[PDB]
Amino acid sequence: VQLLESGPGLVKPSETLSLTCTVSGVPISRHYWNWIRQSPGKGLEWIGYIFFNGNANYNPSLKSRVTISVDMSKNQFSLTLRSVTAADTAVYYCVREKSIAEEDNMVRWFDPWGQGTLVTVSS
Amino acid sequence: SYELTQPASVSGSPGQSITISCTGSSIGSYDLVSWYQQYPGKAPKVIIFEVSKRPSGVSHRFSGSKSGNTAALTISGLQVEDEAIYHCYSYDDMIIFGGGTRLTVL
Amino acid sequence: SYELTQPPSVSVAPGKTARITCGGNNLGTKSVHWYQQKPGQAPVNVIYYDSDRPSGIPERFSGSKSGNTATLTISRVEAGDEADYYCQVWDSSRDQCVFGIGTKVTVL
Amino acid sequence: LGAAGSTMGAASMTLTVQARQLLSGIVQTVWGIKQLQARVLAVERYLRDQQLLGIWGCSGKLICCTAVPWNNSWSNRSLDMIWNNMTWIEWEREIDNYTGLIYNLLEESQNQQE
Amino acid sequence: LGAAGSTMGAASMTLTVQARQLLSGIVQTVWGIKQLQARVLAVERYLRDQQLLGIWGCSGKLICCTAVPWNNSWSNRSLDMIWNNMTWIEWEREIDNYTGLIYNLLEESQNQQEKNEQELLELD
Amino acid sequence: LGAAGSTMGAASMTLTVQARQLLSGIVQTVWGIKQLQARVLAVERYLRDQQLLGIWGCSGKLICCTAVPWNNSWSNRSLDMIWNNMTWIEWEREIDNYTGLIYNLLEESQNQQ
Amino acid sequence: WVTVYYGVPVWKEATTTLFCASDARNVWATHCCVPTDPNPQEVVLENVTENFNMWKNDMVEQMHEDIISLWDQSLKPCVKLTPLCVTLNCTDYERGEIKNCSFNITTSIRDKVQKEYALFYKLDIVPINNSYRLINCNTSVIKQACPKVSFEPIPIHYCAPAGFAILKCNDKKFNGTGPCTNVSTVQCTHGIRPVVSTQLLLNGSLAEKEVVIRSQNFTNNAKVIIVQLNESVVINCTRPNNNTRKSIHIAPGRWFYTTGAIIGDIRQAHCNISRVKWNNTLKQIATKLREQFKNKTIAFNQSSGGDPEIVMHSFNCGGEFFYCNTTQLFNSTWNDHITLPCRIKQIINMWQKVGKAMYAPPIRGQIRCSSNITGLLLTRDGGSNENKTSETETFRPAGGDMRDNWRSELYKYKVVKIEPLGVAPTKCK
Amino acid sequence: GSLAEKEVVIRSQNFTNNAKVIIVQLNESVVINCTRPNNNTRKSIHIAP
Amino acid sequence: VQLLESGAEVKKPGASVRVSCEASGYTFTKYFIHWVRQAPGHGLEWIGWINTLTSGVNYARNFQGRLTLTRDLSTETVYMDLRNLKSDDTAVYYCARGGRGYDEPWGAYTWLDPWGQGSLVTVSS
Ligand SMILES: *[C@@H]1O[C@H](CO)[C@@H](O[C@@H]2O[C@H](CO)[C@@H](O[C@@H]3O[C@H](CO[C@H]4O[C@H](CO)[C@@H](O)[C@H](O)[C@@H]4O)[C@@H](O)[C@H](O[C@H]4O[C@H](CO)[C@@H](O)[C@H](O)[C@@H]4O)[C@@H]3O)[C@H](O)[C@H]2NC(C)=O)[C@H](O)[C@H]1NC(C)=O
Ligand SMILES: *[C@@H]1O[C@H](CO)[C@@H](O[C@@H]2O[C@H](CO)[C@@H](O[C@@H]3O[C@H](CO[C@H]4O[C@H](CO)[C@@H](O)[C@H](O)[C@@H]4O)[C@@H](O)[C@H](O[C@H]4O[C@H](CO)[C@@H](O)[C@H](O)[C@@H]4O)[C@@H]3O)[C@H](O)[C@H]2NC(C)=O)[C@H](O)[C@H]1NC(C)=O
Ligand SMILES: *[C@@H]1O[C@H](CO)[C@@H](O[C@@H]2O[C@H](CO)[C@@H](O[C@@H]3O[C@H](CO)[C@@H](O)[C@H](O)[C@@H]3O)[C@H](O)[C@H]2NC(C)=O)[C@H](O)[C@H]1NC(C)=O
Ligand SMILES: *[C@@H]1O[C@H](CO)[C@@H](O[C@@H]2O[C@H](CO)[C@@H](O[C@@H]3O[C@H](CO)[C@@H](O)[C@H](O)[C@@H]3O)[C@H](O)[C@H]2NC(C)=O)[C@H](O)[C@H]1NC(C)=O
Ligand SMILES: *[C@@H]1O[C@H](CO)[C@@H](O[C@@H]2O[C@H](CO)[C@@H](O[C@@H]3O[C@H](CO)[C@@H](O)[C@H](O)[C@@H]3O)[C@H](O)[C@H]2NC(C)=O)[C@H](O)[C@H]1NC(C)=O
Ligand SMILES: *[C@@H]1O[C@H](CO)[C@@H](O[C@@H]2O[C@H](CO)[C@@H](O[C@@H]3O[C@H](CO)[C@@H](O)[C@H](O)[C@@H]3O)[C@H](O)[C@H]2NC(C)=O)[C@H](O)[C@H]1NC(C)=O
Ligand SMILES: *[C@@H]1O[C@H](CO)[C@@H](O[C@@H]2O[C@H](CO)[C@@H](O[C@@H]3O[C@H](CO)[C@@H](O)[C@H](O)[C@@H]3O)[C@H](O)[C@H]2NC(C)=O)[C@H](O)[C@H]1NC(C)=O
Ligand SMILES: *[C@@H]1O[C@H](CO)[C@@H](O[C@@H]2O[C@H](CO)[C@@H](O[C@@H]3O[C@H](CO)[C@@H](O)[C@H](O)[C@@H]3O)[C@H](O)[C@H]2NC(C)=O)[C@H](O)[C@H]1NC(C)=O
Ligand SMILES: *[C@@H]1O[C@H](CO)[C@@H](O[C@@H]2O[C@H](CO)[C@@H](O[C@@H]3O[C@H](CO)[C@@H](O)[C@H](O)[C@@H]3O)[C@H](O)[C@H]2NC(C)=O)[C@H](O)[C@H]1NC(C)=O
Ligand SMILES: *[C@@H]1O[C@H](CO)[C@@H](O[C@@H]2O[C@H](CO)[C@@H](O)[C@H](O)[C@H]2NC(C)=O)[C@H](O)[C@H]1NC(C)=O
Ligand SMILES: *[C@@H]1O[C@H](CO)[C@@H](O[C@@H]2O[C@H](CO)[C@@H](O)[C@H](O)[C@H]2NC(C)=O)[C@H](O)[C@H]1NC(C)=O
Ligand SMILES: *[C@@H]1O[C@H](CO)[C@@H](O[C@@H]2O[C@H](CO)[C@@H](O)[C@H](O)[C@H]2NC(C)=O)[C@H](O)[C@H]1NC(C)=O
Ligand SMILES: *[C@@H]1O[C@H](CO)[C@@H](O[C@@H]2O[C@H](CO)[C@@H](O)[C@H](O)[C@H]2NC(C)=O)[C@H](O)[C@H]1NC(C)=O
Ligand SMILES: *[C@@H]1O[C@H](CO)[C@@H](O)[C@H](O)[C@H]1NC(C)=O
Ligand SMILES: *[C@@H]1O[C@H](CO)[C@@H](O)[C@H](O)[C@H]1NC(C)=O
Ligand SMILES: *[C@@H]1O[C@H](CO)[C@@H](O)[C@H](O)[C@H]1NC(C)=O
Ligand SMILES: *[C@@H]1O[C@H](CO)[C@@H](O)[C@H](O)[C@H]1NC(C)=O
Ligand SMILES: *[C@@H]1O[C@H](CO)[C@@H](O)[C@H](O)[C@H]1NC(C)=O
Ligand SMILES: *[C@@H]1O[C@H](CO)[C@@H](O)[C@H](O)[C@H]1NC(C)=O
Ligand SMILES: *[C@@H]1O[C@H](CO)[C@@H](O)[C@H](O)[C@H]1NC(C)=O
Ligand SMILES: *[C@@H]1O[C@H](CO)[C@@H](O)[C@H](O)[C@H]1NC(C)=O
Ligand SMILES: *[C@@H]1O[C@H](CO)[C@@H](O)[C@H](O)[C@H]1NC(C)=O
């Protein structure tokens, strides 16, 4: 049911960011996985979604540098951003994606939002 | 034979409801005691399948019961025509038949 | 991709109803979700369709959509509801999540 | 098949490609008889589904909008339970008893009443 | 299916109603051969109608628009005389020797030429 | 059947003329079996093509608009060089090398993407 | 609102006809078989549960029916040996194992009586003086297998027709029935060699970790226990009696093939099995049975049945049908090389099909086959002894139902039909 | 077989052509009791293999 | 369905008897066949069975080494061959179909519907 974020908490400028989130109950193949971030003082920014299989999509602002991995054995996922800037300081949220199979892929708000982990970028 | 300790005989008047039983203990490993009826000079026949399942051709008068070590046949509304030797059938990695209970009708 | 626009803020007296709006192109033809974020906390969904509230969220929460506008309605607003409320849609042409600006709701 | 153990909602996101159309032909004496009968049956099954979708006015669509309101006497589950809890296998079994009814309603509402 | 004795107009009002299809079956070595042949042919007949409607530019819609004018070599009977004074059976007999001709014409205008025109719109 | 020996432009009419179900027709235990098998196979071929066209986003289209730009490595020439010069037989012989590639591209561009 | 979906990932148990696939003369041939898939990659149906049942599995039933059909079609056009069902004049040429029998073919070709002789095994000869009949002379028709047709156990893969799929259970120690968690979808089964044997199973697959013993119900002693080993035992068998073939013109245009002469001396046919591998294998089996039966002693005894095919171990090496004496192997008590003598027969009552029989021509002798012992078919037979005997269970070799051999390789597969249509509630129009 | 609904009816392809069979359909059935009371027993002969 | 035993027989001690049982009205190979004897004063004693398809057998302990049960598929007939007969073996020997079809979890047991008429075998000096 619960999603718990983790990560270095602090990375350097020019360091690749990698955040691993654990799913405590339902096996990860049951629903879609998604990451969202919130820069301090800002609203939400969607990063991307993945699934058990290769169905995935990403936000063009990050797309060229972002992948999210899947570890089925441990029910873990990990967000990797090959960026360099401090503009990526944000609270990263681990959420699960729910949807209703209608026209236009009416994706539901991600009810199991997680707790949120702040990642600071600093020298 | 063995646990199928049937009484030597039973009786009752026509219309009387009566019970024939063996109540052997080795029931649970098979969980099934079926019943047979035999007329003098004849081959035996099944009256009850498995536990209390009445096949076509068998009168509703015949209905059994199984519980714990209970293994019994009740004949409701006893008829003269029901005079017969009755037997328990069980299994304990082999078929065991009871000695039989002789039913007469008064 | 798609536009979701919310006012920066609304303000109500305690016990009064907040009308938190979100606009967009044919917003009323898309499913529109809303969520509540308490400062320092992860957000929670408060409504996922017109008149459809999740369990765990009280009766104060309702909302609807029509035309090019969606509204999150919070009646009997409590001081405990001071929060940033936001709208969400999915954009099938990009197959991406679109979030609105976020409206601060002040409770006097 | 695919991630059949996923919830229906999740499963539907790849419905487009799950529908791989793995039909004979496009993929490619008693024995002769059995082999021929099998080919004929494969054709009949293929067409049966296409014919039914045609009847409902769903031909050409992966996901088809109806003219029949959902009848809640078929199930007490909310959309959340139906789509983001249950799998397609579980779901079809729950409503397997209404299949004929549903199909009849779809046929009438999309053709006779429009 | 009892509307055959009704006029063409009256019966056409129920084509949707009578569009029963009757394609789905129920209860889903010489006799085996005969029945297998029967099933195969039933499929073939079905497909022939669908292919023909498609070649004429028909969507499956029971009544299709056209791009071919009606002319007097086929029939110079007025429309009320056709639609309200005749049954469909009688009508089919009256124009039966033009079936091949009409079908070829329907194809040529409604779909062969029309698709060529659509390509020109796409080129533009 | 028809003007096979004509340019592809001329054959744009031939194209639709021959799009009859030439895969079906009216004729009227070994010989019976051989012909029944042949009929079943003709049906499968028909459906195979109709199915493939649906996959590419073509339904009831004799001339089907695509979502794939022509790739010039596939014997480019010019438009007049083919539409007003080469026949369909000649054209396909030159394009046979890319058939698999073309089909994969048609499906992904028109419907999957 | 009711929404219609197509391409929905659901299925139902269903039966269809599966087809033969082989790598690509022999009976398993491409008129009935097609080429295999070089890369039949499994798809794991992550987090699904499926109830499997090796018993009452129709895949077994189809394998049985098609093997029978192939055999009947193969023998159908071959030579009838009915012209030979006359009284034989038999003497000798282990003792009188093989007899030199003389006979009058009173029809033959051209209606002359032809004096002829052939060498037969005593097992195919019935007394009726020194006058004899063929074992199945009357009541059935014996046909000679065609010399051009082989019956080699090429692994056969069964493949689903379009619209169907085969689900496979990858769980370890699956007991033959009930839920399976690690379920994958496959296009075809692994190749199964259609090997026919009785008592001991040959050239099958091995268990992954330990010997696994499966039964429909262990209490029900009327059921066959199937034992799958995790390690094979190799046995080599031979028919050393070097000979020549005699071609006899019986049919107006056809021919009968028999043994004309023996080259060198006569020695009993035999199988060589390791002393060590055999009793180590039994120790493993006995251990598992001890667990199943709660510590009562496990004993191995001889078959007590009435079928020559069962009391003897039965297999076919090349074209020679062997009946081997295994009473030497199933003779032990487990609580807290070996030469098996064999016999050869020419008349085989294959399938227990009444009215049919087949004849096996000689292959010149000096034939040896090495084979893999992969499992056993055996039954428990004691009972009614809790207060009568010691706590020992006895098991004996069992078999004769060819479906058991095939069941042992199909226990992990199930056939389902794919059902792409379904409906569900939405909020759209 | 079946009975005529109201009366006995007679059908023929032609009634002047005496070479035709006249089919007469009755509207009432007549029941016939057929029996062979001669009791017997079977002998099984081994004719062929 | 019918099942018929051969008639009665009389033997001296130290003898052997062959009792046939013929099946009719059902597929022979579909069902197991059991043999039971009725001994005066003792009710019924189960003796053994055959598979009928594979001629697999099962015998009670007191019959091992003396009793053989076999079958002939072509006549749908089962036979009891019993040796070392004693006066203690006087009983009526009956055959019956076991259980249900072979392919059933408890298919060898609980039926015995078609009991044959029973053949008395008497052993006496
Ligand atoms: C291989 O290993 C698996 C486990 O991984 C075993 O799986 C299950 O085994 C049980 C064994 O009992 C199966 O059968 C059960 O039978 C019960 C019967 O109890 C009543 O009836 C008997 C007489 O028949 C009376 O004596 C008794 O007093 C009762 O009146 C049912 O009650 C069981 O159903 C209930 O429990 C199950 C959960 O186990 C629930 O799902 C049901 O809804 C219900 O509440 C049950 O039917 C059971 O069926 C096996 N499961 C499956 C899917 O098959 C395998 O048996 C084992 N195989 C071998 C050969 O060893
Ligand atoms: C069951 O009951 C039906 C009636 O319901 C009987 O049917 C009639 O049978 C007769 C005999 O065969 C048919 O008579 C034929 O009439 C033709 C002319 O028809 C036209 O003109 C008349 C004029 O009165 C109109 O009523 C009619 O509608 C037509 O417009 C003749 O041409 C036929 O043959 C004669 O001419 C040819 C010319 O080439 C000669 O070669 C012949 O030898 C012959 O001289 C013939 O006379 C009548 O039409 C049928 N009625 C109907 C409604 O079909 C069945 O016979 C009866 N069955 C039985 C078993 O009793
Ligand atoms: C087989 O090849 C011959 C030769 O190319 C085709 O014959 C003629 O081809 C020309 C084009 O090269 C056609 O176009 C017209 O030509 C006249 C010439 O006087 C010109 O004035 C027109 O404006 C136009 O360009 C011409 O119609 C055609 N002639 C005939 C009788 O068909 C022939 O058509 C080819 N066969 C097939 C089946 O295509
Ligand atoms: C999908 O995967 C999950 C995770 O493996 C499967 O559920 C798990 O099932 C096992 C039992 O087979 C549970 O283990 C035991 O449960 C009992 C009862 O609570 C407990 O007393 C034991 O100590 C032990 O934990 C396991 O907890 C459970 N896990 C979860 C998250 O439910 C599930 O069955 C799989 N579903 C399918 C369809 O394959
Ligand atoms: C017949 O069965 C016996 C076992 O019952 C097989 O025994 C042994 O099998 C192995 C492998 O075939 C042979 O191994 C070879 O040994 C020589 C020793 O000089 C070595 O140079 C080779 O590289 C190889 O390791 C072994 O000779 C053989 N005999 C023994 C010692 O038991 C036997 O192979 C079977 N024969 C056949 C193929 O019919
Ligand atoms: C599976 O069981 C068979 C027994 O039926 C094992 O023995 C193999 O039997 C075949 C003949 O049916 C042998 O091939 C023959 O070899 C002679 C050599 O002189 C040749 O003249 C024949 O034309 C034919 O090719 C085969 O060699 C023999 N295999 C071995 C190892 O002895 C078979 O090995 C068992 N195992 C497997 C994996 O199949
Ligand atoms: C396979 O099963 C048979 C049948 O149970 C076993 O033969 C039996 O062996 C026991 C013990 O040796 C014999 O019991 C005793 O025999 C003596 C001498 O006759 C007697 O004086 C005692 O009162 C007692 O009966 C038993 O008679 C004998 N049964 C038969 C039918 O021969 C055999 O040993 C078992 N083999 C294996 C490998 O388990
Ligand atoms: C009994 O079963 C075993 C398998 O459990 C059979 O073992 C076979 O052993 C030979 C080597 O003696 C293997 O051949 C080699 O395979 C490697 C694969 O990487 C290849 O590089 C070598 O050049 C060579 O071909 C053979 O694959 C293996 N069989 C299997 C299925 O793995 C044994 O032959 C069987 N014995 C009998 C009598 O059936
Ligand atoms: C069976 O076939 C015969 C021969 O085709 C049919 O005979 C027709 O019978 C009627 C009534 O007897 C004739 O009508 C009248 O005949 C007199 C002749 O003198 C004429 O003067 C009248 O004006 C009138 O035509 C009819 O001519 C005669 N048929 C010829 C060709 O058919 C008979 O009716 C058929 N019966 C059935 C049940 O079909
Ligand atoms: C869903 O369809 C079913 C079947 O038509 C309806 O079931 C019953 O309908 C009769 C009237 O024809 C009522 O008297 C019963 O009380 C209904 N039973 C139940 C359980 O509802 C059903 O009402 C329909 N439900 C909806 C929501 O449309
Ligand atoms: C047409 O498509 C082909 C296939 O993608 C392109 O050629 C490939 O170029 C790569 C290097 O970038 C080579 O490794 C491949 O082997 C080439 N494949 C083939 C079939 O040639 C080609 O450039 C495209 N042409 C045009 C005009 O778009
Ligand atoms: C087949 O399984 C048996 C299981 O008993 C293996 O034998 C050994 O058994 C002892 C216990 O008695 C364990 O301590 C050993 O670790 C087992 N050895 C191995 C390799 O597992 C037997 O070896 C297995 N055979 C094969 C080929 O794996
Ligand atoms: C069956 O048909 C016969 C005629 O073939 C009917 O006979 C009737 O008999 C009465 C006298 O009993 C007459 O008054 C009627 O005029 C006769 N009717 C006809 C049509 O000829 C007989 O009644 C019919 N049977 C039934 C049950 O209807
Ligand atoms: C809903 O639940 C009630 C019990 O509260 C039951 O009577 C009714 O049949 C259920 N309806 C459906 C569709 O499951
Ligand atoms: C009807 O159309 C055909 C085909 O084009 C033509 O040949 C015929 O002359 C036309 N007849 C009339 C009366 O217009
Ligand atoms: C077609 O031919 C038949 C037979 O001559 C005729 O009855 C029908 O009316 C004809 N149709 C036309 C249009 O001439
Ligand atoms: C590819 O081109 C070569 C000539 O370079 C030709 O021989 C070959 O057949 C072509 N392949 C196809 C599929 O046409
Ligand atoms: C075979 O026939 C000969 C001549 O009648 C006779 O001497 C010989 O003993 C017979 N042998 C056998 C085995 O019957
Ligand atoms: C024994 O074999 C010889 C051939 O060597 C043959 O002539 C003779 O008839 C045979 N004897 C018998 C009894 O078959
Ligand atoms: C063949 O028949 C003759 C005449 O009856 C007899 O003498 C001879 O022994 C027979 N030979 C064989 C081999 O049966
Ligand atoms: C039985 O096991 C022992 C273990 O020490 C071994 O020496 C012996 O060869 C094995 N087999 C036989 C038949 O004795
Ligand atoms: C049990 O095992 C021990 C050691 O193998 C042996 O001495 C003893 O005789 C065995 N007892 C039985 C019941 O076989």
Across the interface, of G220, G306, G355, the residue whose CB is closest to I57 is G306
Is the distance from the beta carbon of residue G331 to the nearest atom of ligand 18 less than 6 Å?
A: no
Q: Which atom of ligand 4 is nearest to the CA of D5?
A: 38
Which ligand 1 atom sits nearest the alpha carbon of residue G214? 60
Chain D, nearest residue to F44 by Cα: D25
| Element housing B75 (H / E) | strand B70-75
Which residue among G86, G89, G115 has the greatest number of ligand 18 atoms within 8 angstroms of its CB, and so is best to mutate? G89
* Torsion sign across C-alpha atoms F43, F44, F46, F50: positive
Of all protein residues, the one whose alpha carbon is nearest to atom 28 of ligand 1 is B31
For F97, phi and psi rounded to 5 degrees? -60, -30
d(CA I6, CA E1): 68
Gap from CA of G278 to ligand 22 centroid (Å) = 20
Cα separation, A11 vs A13, whole angstroms: 7
DSSP per residue, D75-98: ----HHHHHHTS-HHHHHHHTGGG
Instruction: Characterize the bridge pairing of strands C9-12 and C103-107.
Output: parallel
Q: Of all protein residues, whose CA lies closest to atom 33 belonging to ligand 3?
A: F6
CB B74 within 8 Å of CB B63: yes
Q: Which of F73, F75, F105, F109 to mutate to test the pocket of ligand 11 (most atoms within 8 A of CB)?
A: F73
Q: Which residue's structure tokens are 């099946």?
A: I23
Residues on chain F bordering chain D, Cβ-to-Cβ distance under 8 angstroms: 33, 36-37, 40-41, 43-45, 47-48, 51-52, 54-55, 59, 112
Residues 62-101 in I contacting B (C-alpha not used; CB under 8 Å): 94
* CA G330/CA G101 separation, integer angstroms: 37
Chain H neighbors of G85, CB-CB under 8 A: 49
Residues 6 or more apart whose CB falls under 8 angstroms from that of F95 comprise F74, F75, F102
Q: Which of B42, B25, B54 is nearest to B85 (CA)?
A: B42
State the Cα–Cα distance between residues A96 and A86, nearest whole angstrom.
26
- Answer for the pair F67, F45: CB distance below 8 angstroms, yes or no: no
Tokens of G404: 């058991």
First to last CA, chain F: 37
Q: How far away is chain E from the Cα of D79, in angstroms, using its nearest Cα?
A: 32
Written as one letter, the residue type at G162 is A
Q: How far, in Å, CA of E50 to CA of F47, rounded?
A: 12
Tell me the CA distances in angstroms from G145 to D64, F79, G149, G197, one per residue in order. Answer: 61, 68, 8, 19
**What are the strands of the beta sheet with G421-425, ordered from one edge?**
D63-65, G2-6, G421-425
DSSP secondary structure of G82-122: GGG-S-EEE-----SSEEEEEEEESSTTTT--EEEEEEEEG
CB contact under 8 A, G219 and B2: no
Instruction: Report which secondary-structure segment, H or E, holds E102.
Output: helix E99-106
**Inter-chain CB proximity D26 and F54 less than 8 Å:** no
What value does the CA radius of gyration of chain C take, rounded to a whole number of Å? 13
**Pairing mode, if any, of strands A90-97 and B84-91?**
unpaired
Distance in angstroms (rounded) separating the CA atoms of residues F86 and G104: 81
DSSP state of F102: H
Mutation pick for ligand 12 pocket among G172, G210, G281, G285 (CB with most ligand atoms within 8 Å): G210
Write the DSSP string, G344-358: EESEE-GGG-TTEEE
Within 10 A of B21 (CB to CB), how many other CB atoms are there?
Answer: 22
Please enumerate in sequence order all residues whose Cβ is within 8 A of that of H18, keeping only pairs 6 or more positions apart, or say none.
none
Q: Whole-angstrom Cα distance, residue G423 to residue H15?
A: 65
Give this entry's resolution in angstroms: 4.0
Q: Is A7 helix (H, G, I), strand (E, B) or coil?
A: coil
What single string gives the DSSP state of each residue in chain D? ---TTS-HHHHHTTHHHH-----TTT---HHHHHHHHHHHHHHHHHHHHHHHHHHHT-TT-SEEE-SS---GGG----HHHHHHTS-HHHHHHHTGGGHHHHHHHHHIIIII--
Looking at beta carbons, which residues of chain D come within 8 Å of A100?
Answer: 9, 79, 83
Tokens representing F41?
């196979």
DSSP A122: -
Q: Which of G9, G132, G97 is closest to G342 using CA atoms?
A: G97
Distance from CA of I44 to the nearest CA of B (A): 6
Q: Which residues of H touch G138 (CB under 8 A)?
A: 49
Question: Distance between CA D20 and CA D1 in Å, rounded?
Answer: 10
Residues G9, G15, G19: CA angle, nearest 5 degrees: 100
Atom from ligand 4 closest to the CA of residue G181: 39
Q: What are phi and psi of I67, to 5 degrees?
A: -110, 130
* Cα–Cα–Cα angle for C19, C22, C24, rounded to 5 degrees: 150
In this complex, whether E and I touch, counting 3 or more CB pairs under 8 angstroms, is no
What does the block give as tokens for G185? Answer: 């979808």
Indicate the pairing of strand G98-105 with strand G114-121: antiparallel
Select from E21, E30, E48 the residue whose CB has the most chain D CBs within 10 Å, as the one to mutate to test that interface: E21
Name residues whose C-beta falls within 8 Å of residue G269's C-beta, 6 or more positions apart in sequence: G237, G238, G239, G240, G241, G322, G324, G341, G342, G343, G344
Residues D26, F51: C-beta atoms closer than 8 Å: yes
Q: How far apart are CA B33 and CA G30, in angstroms?
A: 54
Quick one: residue B85, left, alpha or beta (phi over 0 = left, psi -120 to 50 = alpha)? Answer: beta
How far is G426 from chain A, CA to nearest CA, in Å?
A: 7
Angle at G167 between CA G161 and CA G168, to 5 degrees: 130
| Bridge pairing between strands A117-121 and A10-11 | parallel
CB contacts of H49 in chain G (<8 Å) are 82, 85, 138-141
Structure tokens at G331: 């003779």
* D112 chain-E contacts, CB cut-off 8 A: 16-17
Residues linked to residue I119 through DSSP beta bridges, in sequence order: I93
The radius of gyration computed from the CA coordinates of chain G, to the nearest angstrom, equals: 26
Within a 10 A sphere around the Cβ of C38, how many other Cβ atoms? 13
CB pair distance less than 8 Å for D46 and F43:
no
Q: How far is the CA of H16 from the centre of ligand 9 (A)?
A: 9
Whole-angstrom CA distances from E74 to A84, E97, G345 are 80, 9, 84
Q: Hey, whose CA ends up nearest to atom 9 of ligand 10?
A: D73
**Helix crossing, E30-55 with D30-56: angle to 10°?**
40
Q: G205 and G190 in contact (C-beta within 8 Å)? A: yes
- Count Cβ neighbours within 10 Å for each residue of A92-123 and write b for 16 or more, e otherwise: bbbbbbbbbbbbbbbbbbbbbbbebbebebee
Please give the method by which this entry was determined: cryo-EM
Tell me the one-letter amino acid at G189. T
G362 Cβ contact partners less than 8 Å away, ≥ 6 residues apart: G243, G245, G257, G258, G259, G319
Return the amino acid letter for A50: I
**Secondary structure of residue C34 in the 3-state scheme:** strand
Residue G284: partners with Cβ closer than 8 Å, 6 or more residues away: G210, G211, G229
